[PDB]
Design an enzyme around this catalytic site. Structure first.
Site, PDB file in Angstrom:
ATOM      1  CG  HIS A  16      -1.820  -1.211   1.318  1.00  0.00           C
ATOM      2  ND1 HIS A  16      -2.695  -1.556   0.278  1.00  0.00           N
ATOM      3  CD2 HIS A  16      -1.972  -2.095   2.320  1.00  0.00           C
ATOM      4  CE1 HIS A  16      -3.309  -2.654   0.673  1.00  0.00           C
ATOM      5  NE2 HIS A  16      -2.911  -3.015   1.894  1.00  0.00           N
ATOM      6  CB  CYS A  25      -2.277   3.474  -4.325  1.00  0.00           C
ATOM      7  SG  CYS A  25      -3.320   2.027  -4.650  1.00  0.00           S
TER       8      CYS A  25
END
Lengths: 400, 400
Positions: free
Chosen positions: A121, A163
């Site tokens: 992440h 991301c």
């Protein structure tokens, strides 16, 4: 010289199956490529292979008909040893700065090549660790600057799956360190999962999770087939861009001249669902498949409810602080501020950290989901808001 | 046929105990070559050897001079303080709910399955070491094997145990009706010996100041490397090790000796140093090789002094308690008591534990070195001495 590799899954939890699956898969590529275990540093929270929810105990697969990738994988740093301090210390080759784990570090020389692969992440200017503290773009780029200053490598290749991964190098990573970076997305995009239950090639019916990430699965599958002498970094970049275009833009940073070098130099030679939603996908799959009136359906439903409650709470609470700090009117909702191309996310990173800190101590943790709001807080930081001003605004918005 | 499972455990830590972890990595390479799957091989190893500050070959562990690396490819299910009695017994029993930390891999076997257990470390009468206390006593271990048999989750089990006085772990405790065959490195009373030691026949490379193996371990491991698994039975292997080790100790067979007729493939696929003195050999080797007037020689000398001081203290202190408790007369100082053949070490194991406990809380630590004196305390236990009586005698003997 010697080819070194650092492979790190920045997350934990069964839902994040894909990140550890990607690390085990990258290891099988390097082992097949001829890299020695003593030169491959593996950081993986070791909670997947024997997870209560894993339908195939002792096995980790990266594709639906894919074979086991877990057996034979080295475990240098597992559990809470998977952290920013240890990751930066393993890169720098500094054993005195390591806490726990095997003690294996990248103790490389000036003729050596380094391949760093990070999957997890991320948000604007930050990449996750299984638990906080997280690793910010300045902290990481300072470690790579120190590595270059010690002259302990010829060239380094950094592949980053997260991301907004572009935001880790844009306006930060210089083209003069002999470092080539490849991010899964640009500065603002989200990366997507692949091999998902509600998608194209689905995992076996037993699986309720995404087996891979699109960018990871792209370059890993590309590395499994296409010959390392036959292929260059630029060629691999183009193969992943072609496969991933609809979802994200794989972006190249640093010395792009390095793209002309072969994959064998770093890797040896062998002879859709949004990442931010993948957690919910899993709870919905758990819920959907569960028989009606069963405890497993009742449990899954309450998990979805709990997750939705936290997402709604965090989003509404940041949304508040932004209106509460400037107003709702003309030119006062700059939380949707777009940083110009080629500029860093923030100028005072220590301030961005303090502002994220004050939000958390008043409004709740930005510990996986919340991470998405790092850009909103960076825009607040760039607007000139102080830690005093932030804590004041946060204090009112999260009044129970 | 079913599944072949293995449990491999090094019961010690510290660079000096190099050999125990080397033996575990070597046993893994035998089983991997034999066709056993990583998901069926549960590995317990401290993992403080490959990257120990003192290891002259970082990332490599060798189990013989001129031997190749035995560390790469080895699974790590339980490392560090996860290497403990509770986790070892839980891995045997296939009970994941009783495990704390580690991968979570356990022996979740069925009635057609075969289990091979290999333990190597320190031991004394009725006890085997763990890297930190609590230690594993003969009653605790044999109760876990009784529970495993009661659940009908194996066809037959082979247990290889390398530790001093290792026969005391099964004699008069291990039943012959559990379908368990045990092979210990020594008798109920003997000591096991190291092999591939700096001060011996075949010495390790000059860089090493530590024993690379154990006579019993190296015997069966080297025997398993060469002689064919279909070609060889458990009885044949026992005879090959007895022939090689005879001068040092008596490898002893316990349980159902009828299983000795089965082939090794069923479970495995297809002038000397005392173990109690090996720590000192290392300190003396460190000292001898060190240049004169150097900090290393000054350090090694002070380590020898410290170790000698503790050994002298513990031995004199137990020696005292024994005279202090009964007298000096030939009938009263009988703590040299010889347990009759086929009888357990003690009858009240909980009492043996409480008596070892009271010695420790009044005098020094009965760890690696102190462990030796367990038989003396068992004879004290058998003589009918209570925890009240023991603590009283100990209290006076360690006023010095």
């Amino acid at each position: 010289g010697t080819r070194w590799a650092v492979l790190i899954a920045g997350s934990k939890g069964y839902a994040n199956y894909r990140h550890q699956a990607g690390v085990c898969h990258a290891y099988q590529i390097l082992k097949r490529g001829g890299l020695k275990d003593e030169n491959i540093v593996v950081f993986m929270y070791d909670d997947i292979a024997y997870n209560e929810s894993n339908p195939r105990p002792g096995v980790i697969i990266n594709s639906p008909h894919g074979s086991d990738v877990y057996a034979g994988v080295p475990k240098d740093y597992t559990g809470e040893e998977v952290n920013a301090k240890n990751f930066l210390a393993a890169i720098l080759g500094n054993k005195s700065a390591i806490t726990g784990g095997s003690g294996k570090v990248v103790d490389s020389g000036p003729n050596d090549h380094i391949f760093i692969y990070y999957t997890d992440h991320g948000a604007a200017g930050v990449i996750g660790m299984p638990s906080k503290p997280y690793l910010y773009a300045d902290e990481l780029n300072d470690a790579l600057k120190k590595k270059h200053a010690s002259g302990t490598y010829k060239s380094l290749v950094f592949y980053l799956e997260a991301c907004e991964s572009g935001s880790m190098f844009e306006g930060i990573l210089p083209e003069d360190l002999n470092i080539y970076a490849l991010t899964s997305t640009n500065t603002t995009e989200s990366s997507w999962c692949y091999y998902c239950p509600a998608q194209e090639n689905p995992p076996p019916p037993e699986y309720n999770v995404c087996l891979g990430d699109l960018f990871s699965v792209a370059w890993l599958e590309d590395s499994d087939v296409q010959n390392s002498w036959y292929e260059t970094l630029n060629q691999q970049y183009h193969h992943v861009d072609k496969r991933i275009s609809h979802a994200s833009h794989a972006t190249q940073y640093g010395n792009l001249k390095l793209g002309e070098e072969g994959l064998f130099v770093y890797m040896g030679s062998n002879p859709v669902v949004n990442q931010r939603d993948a957690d919910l996908l899993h709870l919905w799959e758990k819920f959907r498949k569960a028989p009606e009136g069963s405890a497993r359906k009742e449990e899954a439903q309450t998990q979805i409810f709990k997750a939705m409650s936290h997402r709604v709470h965090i989003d509404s609470s940041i949304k508040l602080i932004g209106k509460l700090l400037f107003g709702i009117e003309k030119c006062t909702e700059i939380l949707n501020a777009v940083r110009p191309a080629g500029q860093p996310l923030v100028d005072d990173w220590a301030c961005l950290r303090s502002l994220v800190g004050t939000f958390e101590t008043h409004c709740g943790s930005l510990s996986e989901y919340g991470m998405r709001h790092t850009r909103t807080i960076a825009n607040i930081c760039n607007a000139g808001i102080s830690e005093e001003q932030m804590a004041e605004a946060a204090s009112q918005a999260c009044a129970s």
